[PDB]
Amino acid sequence: MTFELKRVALPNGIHLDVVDEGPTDAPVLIFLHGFPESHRTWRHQIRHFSDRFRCIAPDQRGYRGSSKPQEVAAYTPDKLIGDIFLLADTLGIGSFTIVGHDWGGAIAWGVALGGQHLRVERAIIANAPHPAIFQKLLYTHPVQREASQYIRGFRDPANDALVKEHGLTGLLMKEVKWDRPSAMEPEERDQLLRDWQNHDAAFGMLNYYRASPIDVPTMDAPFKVPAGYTPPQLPRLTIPTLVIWALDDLALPPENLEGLEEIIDPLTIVRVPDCGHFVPWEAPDAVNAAMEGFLAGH
């Protein structure tokens, strides 16, 4: 399966290749993939909703044919969040629902929190931790700290020799702490294996972790918030928000949902039992069902 991509030049000097399907003046859903995927992550939802919604899905910075600057700092969270507002600007989209999975969901939380009521009318987040919650969990909760040890591997510049020899695939093969995808259609797998052979993309994709200010301690460090840690002041999220959470995601255990109710209103949580990390395509019918109910005009 293939979507037509268009190249969108942005005023920060980046271009993004993007899916743009559906009626031009329909309500907009902007879909953000995570690592190590592509605009294809939300394929099932894009095809499901593009009869009624304008569906935008970029290959984000660092991915596939989009700009792949090699410097780590080109991937700081502000830049990744900024790319989405600039993409909406360039396409003439005043307000949209932001939809994100994994890194796309982390970016989506930022987009929603910053842009709510001005640019962002609803948020849909699937298996991506909330920035008010995640850093604290890494400090306090062994389940989460253990779950996130792969990030330390992805950050280790001693692994770059392996990426240069074997593409991203070599590091994914080597990094046993990384939670691997479940069974996917052969055509989808083939595309990713081809994508992962591009050196510049492999590093751009890894740079999300390398540029992130998130602190993932070793399992040796005390399970307490450091004395000098100041929790970023965030606003509450006061746009309609759907959080979808596959319960067998080994990277992002369900503890990530604790505390969401206090900081989001109106919040809907849809737990997906017996499903791993890649929920948009591992459980597309549950995801489509959740989105249908949530997006309904009543």
Numbering used by the authors: 1 to 298
Task: Provide passages from the article that reported this PDB entry.
The ORF found in the Russian metagenome (Sibe-eh) is 891 nt long and encodes for a protein (Sibe-EH) of 297 amino acids that has 30% identity with the CH65-EH protein sequence. Sibe-EH is monomeric in the crystal structure and in solution which is similar to many other bacterial EHs and plant, such as potato, EHs. All residues of Sibe-EH plus one His residue belonging to the C-terminal His tag have been modeled into the electron density. The amino acids Pro36 and Pro266 are in the cis- conformation in the Sibe-EH structure. The Sibe-EH was active on all tested substrates resulting in conversions > 99% for substrates (2), (5), and (6), around 90% for substrates (3) and (4), and around 40% for substrate (1). Sibe-EH displayed an optimum temperature at 30°C and retained more than 40% of activity at 40°C, while CH65-EH showed the highest activity at temperatures around 50°C and retained more than 60% of activity at 70°C. The substrate epoxide oxygen binds to the side chain hydroxyls of Tyr150 and Tyr209 in Sibe-EH, and its likely position is marked by a conserved water molecule interacting with these residues. In the case of CH65-EH and Sibe-EH the entrance to the active site cavity as seen in B. megaterium EH is totally obstructed by the adjacent monomer in the CH65-EH dimer and by a very different conformation in Sibe-EH in the region of residues 159–180. The high ee observed for the meso-epoxide in the Sibe-EH reaction can be explained by the formation of favorable protein-ligand hydrophobic interactions when the ligand is attacked at the (S)-carbon to release the (R, R) product.
